[PDB]
Every structure is written in C-alpha cells, then in structure tokens.
Amino acid sequence: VNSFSGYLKLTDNVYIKNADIVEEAKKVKPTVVVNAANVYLKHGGGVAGALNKATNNAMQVESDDYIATNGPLKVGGSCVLSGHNLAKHCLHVVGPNVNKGEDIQLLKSAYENFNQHEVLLAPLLSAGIFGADPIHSLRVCVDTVRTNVYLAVFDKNLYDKLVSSFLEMKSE
Numbered sequence: 001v002n003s004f005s006g007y008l009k010l011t012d013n014v015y016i017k018n019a020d021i022v023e024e025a026k027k028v029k030p031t032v033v034v035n036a037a038n039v040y041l042k043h044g045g046g047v048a049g050a051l052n053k054a055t056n057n058a059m060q061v062e063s064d065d066y067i068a069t070n071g072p073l074k075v076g077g078s079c080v081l082s083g084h085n086l087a088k089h090c091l092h093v094v095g096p097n098v099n100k101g102e103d104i105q106l107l108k109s110a111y112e113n114f115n116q117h118e119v120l121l122a123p124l125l126s127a128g129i130f131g132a133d134p135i136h137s138l139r140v141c142v143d144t145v146r147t148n149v150y151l152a153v154f155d156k157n158l159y160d161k162l163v164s165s166f167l168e169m170k171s172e
C-alpha cells in the first residue's frame, strides 16, 4: 500500500515525520519496514523491542531461526525477513554501535542497504542505544540513500532539532 501521509520533504527522496514507527507501520502497511538491529538479531529495547512486541514475539523467533541457520550479521549489513502483521518485509539493518567502539563510518555501509528497496519506512540508525548523534545519522541517510525513505522520529523535540539542523546543513 505505502500510503504515507503527513511527512515533511527534506530532499527528493528523504521524508521525515514526528511519529512512532510501529503506529506508522500499522497505518501504512508498507512493503518494507526497517529494524535498527544488532548482529545477532536479539531484539532488546528501542525500535527493535517495539517492532518485536507488535508481532507478539514472532519477529524474535524468526530471527533466532535465521541466526541459527546463517550465523550473525556483519556490522553495516542487513537481512530481509518477514514483516509479520506490520509490513510485508522487515529489513534488519545493523548500524555501528559507537558505544561499543565500532566505527561510525559503518553507518554509511548500513544505510546503503536501503538502496535495494523502492520505498522504506525507517528509523534513524544507531542514534539511540548505539549512541550516534541523531543529526549525523540523518546526514548520512540524506547523503547515502537514493531510494524513497520515510523516517519516523517519535520524539517531538528531537524532530524539531533535526529539522533545524538539516536547514543549517543545507544552506551552509
């Protein structure tokens, strides 16, 4: 369906909305929802816990089965699994965990995976539990992704700070 509404257009292909990503997925029924994951697909808190909780833990069982068969992901890597009741597909992407000293440059590698999908509902990778600057995560997204990406930012204060930062980045 991909029926997105109420987004602010930042560039030709990046959009942003002050919204919860699970509530957006339930309203839009997208082809692809992005999970901000770790390499073992152990869905803890933040976006990963929210999506898994909305699938009634189905996402975790599937991920456990995927990892057992295939082994862990690499940082900057991804895998496509079921979106369960939220989306057709879920793209699990691993941003660098800068809190564990992983290389912030792998955020470029992480967002590159979006380019295999016509349209995506996504969060800001690495910007929460993994400790990257949200503004920096938005910049890499804008500089790296060429396909259609609708970003869900649930916190209204972060959203307002992100837009103001983006305007500053664009005019300077």
Ligand SMILES: Nc1ncnc2c1ncn2[C@@H]1O[C@H](COP(=O)(O)OP(=O)(O)OC[C@H]2NC[C@H](O)[C@@H]2O)[C@@H](O)[C@H]1O
Binding pocket: 019, 020, 021, 023, 045, 046, 047, 049, 050, 127, 128, 129, 154, 155
């Ligand atoms: N109507 C509604 N129902 C249910 N859940 C909702 C709703 N609206 C929003 N949400 C989302 O439920 C989520 C509850 O908060 P939570 O899952 O705890 O997110 P976090 O605050 O942990 O975000 C993770 C990271 N952000 C920066 C910090 O470093 C955290 O590590 C939060 O994202 C809300 O936006």
Ligand SMILES: Nc1ncnc2c1ncn2[C@@H]1O[C@H](COP(=O)(O)OP(=O)(O)OC[C@H]2NC[C@H](O)[C@@H]2O)[C@@H](O)[C@H]1O
Binding pocket: 019, 020, 021, 022, 036, 037, 038, 042, 043, 044, 045, 046, 047, 048, 049, 050, 095, 123, 124, 125, 126, 127, 128, 129, 130, 131, 132, 134, 152, 153, 154, 155
């Ligand atoms: N429900 C929801 N909707 C929208 N945006 C959200 C939500 N929950 C968190 N966020 C925001 O999305 C951003 C991504 O943070 P997070 O979900 O912690 O992902 P990370 O890439 O930083 O960390 C990944 C790790 N968290 C649990 C996973 O199992 C990974 O180990 C950050 O700005 C959060 O405040």
Ligand code: NA
Binding pocket: 133, 135
């Ligand atoms: Na900054």
Ligand code: NA
Binding pocket: 156, 157, 158, 160, 161
């Ligand atoms: Na604000």
